[PDB]
Design a protein around this nucleic acid. Structure first.
Ligand SMILES: [Mn+2]
Ligand SMILES: [Mn+2]
Ligand SMILES: [Mn+2]
Lengths: 112, 116
DNA sequence: CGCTAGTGTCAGGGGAAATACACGTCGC
DNA sequence: GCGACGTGTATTTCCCCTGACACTAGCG
């Protein structure tokens, strides 16, 4: 029972940080775009500080007023593991595998 | 209907129910068991069955009669799109480098070799 | 006809979200 | 110094889960 009992909201913040470390309101904006609604910072911050104290996020300082949050490798392990569990249960056919890799081929083609 | 309108607001519990049925359609306690092996704890059916009743009214899970004491649950088309759409988001936030990408390429290569 | 499998379900307890309230700071 | 930035936080709210209590239907 490591990354299992996380909340949907929380793991979203984990996959957010997998792309690159960000500073807070930078997370609110990207979460606002996935959900499709305003995410109130009263909800964001408190959940962040629960991951830090469980060893999945590190709340390093950037300004006198800005913080930079990033994934501890223990938190990065949480991202990869339940990504394996979904790929485990998704890739159950030839054509499903051909779909996952054509997804990842496009994802890396936009990388630049 | 689009699955992102609905599937993006679901519980972690509910999203795990989805990924499970994305493997194959199963009946009630088959989900319960194969969810327990993922969590590691117990999964009270008093929580399970209602969470499936939620997914069937949003049009993502189908409920049919195998016999009149056992129903078989399965993802429908909107349900299937909800599973892949959540996969397309996770991947793009994880595929950020050749290093990250390959780790995926070998994760699926292993799971595809495990189908024999 | 006992006993289990298989689901229904609801009052009760629990815990995070809304929605305000608040204060330092960079910027200009 | 006056504006928005960036973050803290609480308590009231609300909703989901925990924990029974229940009922049918197969299996013998
Ligand atoms: Mn806000
Ligand atoms: Mn039970
Ligand atoms: Mn894509």
């Amino acid at each position: 029972s490591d990354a299992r009992d996380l909340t949907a909201f929380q793991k979203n913040i984990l996959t957010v940080l997998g792309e690159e470390a960000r500073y807070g309101l930078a997370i609110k904006r990207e979460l606002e775009e996935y959900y499709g609604e305003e995410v109130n910072h009263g909800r964001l911050y408190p959940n962040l500080d629960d991951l830090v104290n469980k060893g999945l996020v590190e709340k390093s300082e950037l300004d006198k007023r800005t913080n930079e949050y990033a994934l501890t490798n223990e938190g990065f392990d949480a991202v990869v593991d339940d990504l394996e569990w979904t790929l485990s249960k998704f890739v159950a056919d030839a054509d499903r595998r051909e779909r996952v890799e054509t997804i990842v081929a496009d994802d890396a083609a936009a990388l630049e």
